[PDB]
């Protein structure tokens, strides 16, 4: 069974999974893969995940990827509490639905500030003023949508209780926060929901799932960051190259 | 029950759903919403989907969105064949996994040629030469990944049989094709897979699910295209504004 989980806690989807697995007490072998360094691109790793993306979960000789797939798969195999990923047609659908939008509107837009302030400069590459703004006015744009469209009156994006939908959302949101952007400033709805979740999860877990990234801006200043391999350098140039 | 499906067959996710529903014979009330025109933004529609996105499926007073959620939801409620969306842990996982990558790497990159050639100019807005190329070299970049990473030796991205994963993939891919980009040129793997699927689905269905978009380049020429509302004008400028 083994059941190892290659991941880097600077990777927002990685955190999500790690958090889920931890909160439901799932025997997991935490395989650390320095992303900043370019570990996920090491020949040895590509031998595990031809894609070289994190977090990838290896169960048996079955290697899966995609925090969504992994979570869902996990949650299933380990019959985790139902509220998480409900078996109710309407309910599950409500989850499936946000995740899809999340993948569209949240994922990839809220990680940008990290590139603009850390990973970018790390390779001498500086992001254009515009892209920066464009991106932020794009964030709150989504923040709102999330706010009143998904969150609205209820306590969670995916309904009445905590669910994969929240774990993912919040975790992704955490990044710009960690970099200094206080998105929960003028959003008591959002704020309250976050607090509600964190509350649920627990200080301990969150205090450690994050850690890595709240420090990172400093490691950045203190030049503690590893020099990325030419393989990571490439991926990094691409990502930066797809910032609108 | 009603079970209406607002959608515009120029919208690749819309096609997907429509196709699934049609192939499995699901009683569906096809609610057409001119996207090009700006229908999905009409006050009356926002009263149905605060988001104004297509295709949105209204079952009972339950309004759902996200082709993924919809499909899955559909497939469930209408106990459609298992191969589609398997109940097997490894299997389903493999689907869930692609969809996530699909949402990341395919969705949003393969619709661009339509904006560059049609929707864009339709509002006097012309896309920069770079973005164009960047985008295409980005498409085949994904095409390959899809090709040998997901497709590889097996017959489908999601395993051995047709599955939501394919319906969506192929449909999205169809756009640049319909625009004149022959992505299946130097990819016998890709080509064969497509042919495999189309085969399965049937000429009739495909012959009509597409239609709308293979014509569109013409309607474009012949100025048959509806002038978009200031609401659609906005969304159109945003979308174009997020082309890297």
UniProtKB/Swiss-Prot annotation, chains A, B:
Q: Spell out the coiled coil positions from the record.
A: none
Query: In which tissues does this protein get expressed?
Result: Expressed at low levels in liver. In lung, expressed at low levels in ciliated bronchiolar cells, alveolar macrophages and alveolar type II cells.
Would you identify the family this protein belongs to, as annotated? Answer: Belongs to the GST superfamily. Theta family.
Name by which UniProt lists this protein: Glutathione S-transferase theta-2B
Location of the GST C-terminal domain: 88-224
The reaction(s) this protein catalyses: RX + glutathione = an S-substituted glutathione + a halide anion + H(+)
Which Pfam families would you find in this protein's record?
Answer: GST_C, GST_N
Xref: SUPFAM superfamilies: GST C-terminal domain-like, Thioredoxin-like
The species is Homo sapiens (Human)
Query: By which gene is this protein encoded?
Result: GSTT2B
Q: Which GO terms describe its cellular component?
A: cytoplasm; cytosol; extracellular exosome
Record localization = Cytoplasm, Cytosol
> Where is each GST N-terminal domain found?
2-82
Q: Name one GO molecular function term.
A: glutathione transferase activity
Assembly information from the UniProt record: Homodimer.
